[PDB]
């Protein structure tokens, strides 16, 4: 029913549990977005990427 | 200077729970008791009245 | 009876939030023992705070202070 | 005419309340007037820092209102918040979506 | 009759709206944040009390709080907090 | 839906993905709400509880049990089990300084 | 008519005249006594120890 | 010139009270000084928090007695409360 | 007039050995509360003195059993780690140059 | 083999001395510190207080690791065990 | 001079610390990770001691600055004072 708006990612996450395509802690693999990052996370990455 | 002296003979042990003469004092509650049914009674008292009876004789609790 | 109020499926639910795949049949009652001694250690400190405060309803503050002292703190109960 | 210390510091948080607490919290006999400015700015910053992640967590988890889940998500993903909040727990906060990979079916 | 009860409510709500204007917050989540704000204040000011004794000082002071926050905060969270505390002192000391 | 009856010891993962996601408290309120009184009354009789105090206890205690179980998961995986077994809890509770 | 004490000695302590304190038990009650000198010079003389059962003619 | 404010003579007097044959190496005196100072900071810190939680200006014998009741373990708490109440009992006369 | 010559200490009036006046001095200058009770430092001194008596008695037993009578950090560590009550009071602390309590696991012992 | 290792355990648990050499550890302290600040000085006792805390931390780590290894029945130890001990005591993740 | 003086932690010292911890056999994988774990502990204690020293404006670290680091890290030490 209408619960598909919250169930579909779990339905995909079970399909990926069969396929074994999960990430290093068992999530569905996803695009990283740097617009979500704080100035401190940007600084931690700046200090790592050298 | 009118306060009377401290007593010259030692104080009797009257039992705390009944006033009858106390041949005994309990290692746990430190009260004075006279009979076996008084020992059976004092081990059923709450700590509050035990320290109450002790304080009533300026003994080892406040 | 009261300690068995930690239900056999509640042990499974809690361990499944804890990520574990499978439970051995002996886990349950000794885990109630662990929950019991943890509850007891926090509740007795909370009562110790409540008695100094003269009150005799155990407050959310009495248990927050016990948990804060024991380094098992929580937020959301007005710390 | 009068105005708050917060307005001069550029702070939202009430600097006078912080100075009143720095007295009454039994920390020392005296308190420098810039100490609550610096400390309120740190409190306000730590609050802005965590709630920026909470707002992004709420938005990504498809909700308009921040709830204890979005706080736990903000707290446990950033290791410096997680390491600061190591000895504390969150009212109804749950935990991260994280699976021990050895437990997957093979 | 009951007294007024102390919490940072409009100030944490203003701190939310200045970074996520679109977003609301629950009374539970506000209670978690108000608890956290008071707890971190107590850690910083409690450690500051020891730093004061270690230096025989009578005054809790921004120069000394700048040591207590870098002791308590892990990693770069210290560096950003020390910067913003310095920016707040910069705005205030420009006027007094 | 589609995996249905797939591999016993894997509806376990269907359970992890329910309880890890959700805000619920997994012990029933009423049994626990009596048990906290029974634990308290041995030290001082005739105690009441704030209706928030029992919830603060439950939420701290379920978090303590959940953290213990996840540490116990590492104790099982370290010994190459996916079944938690009593000795796993004994290791965790000793190393965290709770039993020694 | 004779006054007789009769019990298990639960614990017994002696200082350095002497003062000491002695505890006695039956299957039904427990007691502590501050001892007088002429008991100390008997309990020590007869090497009494905790867990003994002892009967004492109090007059002697 | 400079000072340290140690408990040294008091802990040594207590040693000779419990065991008249026994003595202290200054390295063990360093343990005892560290210990009694730390337990003082623990109890006074607990009592301070407890008084502030109860919105008092004062710590008194009941604040400290409760702070000790929190800090100490099993039989040592029972004996510590026993000696704390004995001392206040024989002081208040 | 003038104040009392050889005025009796709070400690010796209480029957204590620890410096009750210093306990009050340090409670007040240590900033723990803005006011402090007169019997508060008596109680605190008596607890610190009791803990001191107990820990040193167990250390002196450890020294006696070790064929010694000068306490060294070793005897205190042996006392503190033999007694479960001191051990659980003292879990977050190291006794400097006291070493560790000697212990072999049952799996490492012979046969 | 393996009998004299039990006699080593008995000997080092009877003794109370520093197990790391003073001069190498004294350099290690200074060599780490020189990028937390330029040109640190150290009081003579400070290097010893550092070394005592570090050796006590390491003895406690090996004690907790012993319980990890013997839980896994293996009498020999590997990083496989230490990475439980840190993760479960709480210094990591 | 300056160097990676964690290799001043001689292998017999690691064996002795392990043998004092009662572990009987010590694999070749232990030693260099254990050097890392020791170094990581020193880094925090030194970071903190350096900051207690910065309030005092000192270059000279005392046993107190480390005892205070050990207090904030909850691994307190008796014998040096504090």
UniProtKB/Swiss-Prot annotation, chain A:
It is found in: Nucleus; Nucleus, Nucleolus. Component of the chromatin remodeling INO80 complex; specifically part of a complex module associated with the helicase ATP-binding and the helicase C-terminal domain of INO80. Interacts with RP9. Induces growth and cell cycle arrests at the G1 phase of the cell cycle. This is INO80 complex subunit B. The lineage of its organism: Eukaryota, Metazoa, Chordata, Craniata, Vertebrata. The gene is INO80B. The chain holds residues 140 to 189 of 356 of the full protein.
UniProtKB/Swiss-Prot annotation, chain B:
It is found in: Nucleus. GO terms for cellular component: cytosol; fibrillar center; Ino80 complex; MLL1 complex; nucleoplasm. GO terms for biological process: chromatin remodeling; DNA recombination; DNA repair; positive regulation of DNA repair; positive regulation of DNA-templated transcription; positive regulation of telomere maintenance in response to DNA damage; regulation of cell cycle; regulation of chromosome organization. Keywords: DNA damage, DNA recombination, DNA repair, Nucleus, Transcription, Transcription regulation. Proposed core component of the chromatin remodeling INO80 complex which is involved in transcriptional regulation, DNA replication and probably DNA repair. Component of the chromatin remodeling INO80 complex; specifically part of a complex module associated with the helicase ATP-binding and the helicase C-terminal domain of INO80. Component of some MLL1/MLL complex, at least composed of the core components KMT2A/MLL1, ASH2L, HCFC1/HCF1, WDR5 and RBBP5, as well as the facultative components BACC1, CHD8, E2F6, HSP70, INO80C, KANSL1, LAS1L, MAX, MCRS1, MGA, MYST1/MOF, PELP1, PHF20, PRP31, RING2, RUVB1/TIP49A, RUVB2/TIP49B, SENP3, TAF1, TAF4, TAF6, TAF7, TAF9 and TEX10. This is INO80 complex subunit C. It comes from Homo sapiens. The lineage of its organism: Eukaryota, Metazoa, Chordata, Craniata, Vertebrata. The gene is INO80C. The chain holds residues 129 to 190 of 192 of the full protein.
Swiss-Prot record, chain F:
Signal peptide: none annotated. The modification N6,N6-dimethyllysine is found at residues 1, 44. The modification N6-crotonyllysine is found at residue 21. The modification N6-methyllysine is found at residues 1-2, 21, 29, 44, 87. GO terms for biological process: chromatin organization; epigenetic regulation of gene expression; gene expression; nucleosome assembly; telomere organization. The modification N6-glutaryllysine is found at residues 21, 44, 80, 87. The keyword Oxidoreductase does not apply. The modification N6-acetyllysine is found at residues 1, 21, 44, 80, 87. Coiled coil: none annotated. GO terms for molecular function: cadherin binding; DNA binding; protein heterodimerization activity; structural constituent of chromatin. The keyword Ubl conjugation applies. It comes from the Eukaryota. Keywords: Acetylation, ADP-ribosylation, Chromosome, Citrullination, Disease variant, DNA-binding, Hydroxylation, Lipoprotein, Methylation, Nucleosome core, Nucleus, Phosphoprotein, Ubl conjugation. The modification Phosphoserine is found at residues 22, 51. It is found in: Nucleus; Chromosome. The modification Phosphotyrosine is found at residue 6. GO terms for cellular component: extracellular exosome; extracellular region; membrane; nucleoplasm; nucleosome; nucleus; protein-containing complex. Acetylation is generally linked to gene activation. Acetylation at Lys-87 (H3K122ac) by EP300/p300 plays a central role in chromatin structure: localizes at the surface of the histone octamer and stimulates transcription, possibly by promoting nucleosome instability. The modification N6-lactoyllysine is found at residues 21, 44. Belongs to the histone H3 family. It is linked to Glioma: Gliomas are benign or malignant central nervous system neoplasms derived from glial cells. They comprise astrocytomas and glioblastoma multiforme that are derived from astrocytes, oligodendrogliomas derived from oligodendrocytes and ependymomas derived from ependymocytes. This is Histone H3.1. It comes from Homo sapiens.
Swiss-Prot record, chain G:
Ubiquitously expressed. Highly expressed in testis and thymus. It is found in: Nucleus matrix; Nucleus, Nucleoplasm; Cytoplasm; Membrane. It comes from the Eukaryota. Possesses single-stranded DNA-stimulated ATPase and ATP-dependent DNA helicase (5' to 3') activity; hexamerization is thought to be critical for ATP hydrolysis and adjacent subunits in the ring-like structure contribute to the ATPase activity. Component of the NuA4 histone acetyltransferase complex which is involved in transcriptional activation of select genes principally by acetylation of nucleosomal histones H4 and H2A. This modification may both alter nucleosome -DNA interactions and promote interaction of the modified histones with other proteins which positively regulate transcription. Belongs to the RuvB family. The C-terminal domain is required for association with ATF2. This is RuvB-like 2. It comes from Homo sapiens (Human). The lineage of its organism: Eukaryota, Metazoa, Chordata, Craniata, Vertebrata. The gene is RUVBL2. The chain holds residues 134 to 199 of 463 of the full protein.
